[model samples]
Target chain A: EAGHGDLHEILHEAVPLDANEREILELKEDAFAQRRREIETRLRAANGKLADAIAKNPAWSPEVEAATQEVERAAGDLQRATLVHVFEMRAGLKPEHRPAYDRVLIDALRR
Target chain B: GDLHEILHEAVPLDANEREILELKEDAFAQRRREIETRLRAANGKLADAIAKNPAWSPEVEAATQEVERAAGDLQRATLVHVFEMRAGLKPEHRPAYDRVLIDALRRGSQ
Candidate 1:
């Protein structure tokens, strides 16, 4: 009797659920995907622009040039960090993966 | 002939000729001295500019190295040239003075 009552309640809730809920969920998911894509695209563009600006700016000292190169070199590390973060979020990976991910992102920004 | 005519014939003087020639000589000497002074000042300015110009400093340093190496080469070449000169080498066979003179001039310019 309890199980039957529980099934009846679930059916009652499911039957009356608005179609808009599904649409809203899909939109939310799409927005999240678009946001992630935009961020990654901007990151790539920023790196490229910075590289080019550094190269073309004759006023940039040798030290500044070297720093710019360092920034470019660490881009890979940043990408790896982002990937690891994505993996952790999707796969429920261990918390230990966080430090490596954080390190890469921070290193990229610092450079 | 009059005194003026006689002096003119004797010393080849014309009207204002002696004074003008003296003045002209003095001017020529003064101009030469001015040129030498100006050249000395220009040389100092060029040396200072070479020291201060960052872009040119490296080039000047490199030129100095080249001049040093050339000096050593010249020393060896001169010894050879001198030996030949002492051996009664013909003008056609012997080294010319131009190279030595030019090198000296270039060194002096630097």
Candidate 2:
């Protein structure tokens, strides 16, 4: 089972992304790029809102609340975006290949 | 090496070298954790600074410096750790690891 390679790469090798599965990885790449931009934009806007509050004489709670909420929202969005890919990949995996998939995923974390 | 390549074969290492390399990796674990945590904050600070302050303001520069320093620190630690492990291998075992190291470094392993 442990021939020679990183568990992640090796485990995924057998049922290597066939056409249907290949699309998810390709899409995930673009998704990650856009996800990054989206986070930056949200955080930028959040900071702006905070700075605007600071410019005014408002209490610190509102500033902290707004920034923290926006950042957490961005984080939540990232988690969902990642799952879109993860679920698709898992769903697309062949039933037979699932054994290797499960084993490798487990071993990868152990390593 | 394909991560496990070194594990499967007898990648020449004497007792001292092998033990030190493992210890080095153990040592690296926490340092890496610390840097990863700081890097996240540094990245956020840089973005927040750029967003709120005009470009070239002290706020922006300070954040940029922190990020730049973090990047350097992260990069050096990672790079050094790899070489530190590689240097532990014996002469005959060097080729496979070299292939692994070269591939990773060419991709800017950091």
* Top-DockQ structure, candidate number: 2
Question: Candidate 1 residues B1-110, lDDT tens each?
Answer: 12112212223345676676556445434544554454344334433433344123444344333433343333233323323332342355323432332233222211
What are the clash counts of all predictions, listed in order? Answer: 0, 1
Judging by TM-score against the true structure, name the best candidate.
2
Candidate 1 lDDT over residue span A2-106, tens digit each: 122232233334334464544543454465456557665654554454334434432234543443344333433343333333333322323444344333323
Question: Against the true structure, candidate 1 has what lDDT?
Answer: 0.37
What C-alpha lDDT do the candidate models reach, one value each?
A: 0.37, 0.49
DockQ of 1: 0.01
Mark the regions of model 1 whose C-alpha exceeds 4 Å error after superposition: A1-32, A58-81, A89-111, B1-110
The weakest ten consecutive residues by lDDT in model 1 chain A span: A1-10
Which pairs clash in model 1?
A: none
TM-score of 1: 0.20
Winning candidate number (lDDT): 2
